[PDB]
Swiss-Prot record:
The chain holds residues 555 to 674 of 1058 of the full protein. Component of some HBO1 complex composed of KAT7/HBO1, MEAF6, ING4 and BRD1/BRPF2. Component of the MOZ/MORF complex composed at least of ING5, KAT6A, KAT6B, MEAF6 and one of BRPF1, BRD1/BRPF2 and BRPF3. Interacts (via PHD-type zinc finger domain) with unmodified histone H3. Interacts (via PWWP domain) with dimethylated and trimethylated 'Lys-79' on histone H3. The lineage of its organism: Eukaryota, Metazoa, Chordata, Craniata, Vertebrata. It comes from Homo sapiens. There is a cross-link at K41 (Glycyl lysine isopeptide (Lys-Gly) (interchain with G-Cter in SUMO2)). This is Bromodomain-containing protein 1. It is found in: Nucleus; Chromosome. Highly expressed in testis.
């Protein structure tokens, strides 16, 4: 149908906007602490701690499969990255501190993205 196509154009454009958001969030992690999944070879007990692991490469795979329906779903995945880290790692670690800084710096980007998504529909 003509509608399904219209729908698919909006998804593609959402994907386009979310790709830019993702790049902006990932620049706020210059140490690349959150770039890839926590290695289960190097942290064999990780899944006993964190039930829903997340990282930027995993989000990108979902993004490029047009797997995010709205910004809320995308934010859920970003929030997992941060919250998983803040639980697994203690307060006095480079990892916990990296997550706090990502959360704080990402807030600005996510604020404007919500306005853009509402604005452009």
């Amino acid at each position: 149908s003509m509608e399904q196509v219209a729908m698919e154009l909006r998804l593609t454009e959402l994907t386009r906007l979310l790709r830019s958001v993702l790049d902006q969030l990932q620049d706020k992690d210059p140490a690349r602490i959150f770039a890839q999944p926590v290695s289960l070879k190097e942290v064999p007990d990780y899944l006993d701690h964190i039930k829903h692991p997340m990282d930027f490469a995993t989000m990108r795979k979902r993004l490029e499969a047009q797997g995010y329906k709205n910004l809320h779903e995308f934010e859920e995945d970003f929030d997992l990255i941060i919250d998983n880290c803040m639980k697994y790692n203690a307060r006095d670690t480079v990892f916990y501190r990296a997550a706090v800084r990502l959360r704080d710096q990402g807030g600005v980007v996510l604020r404007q993205a919500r306005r853009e998504v509402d604005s452009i529909g």
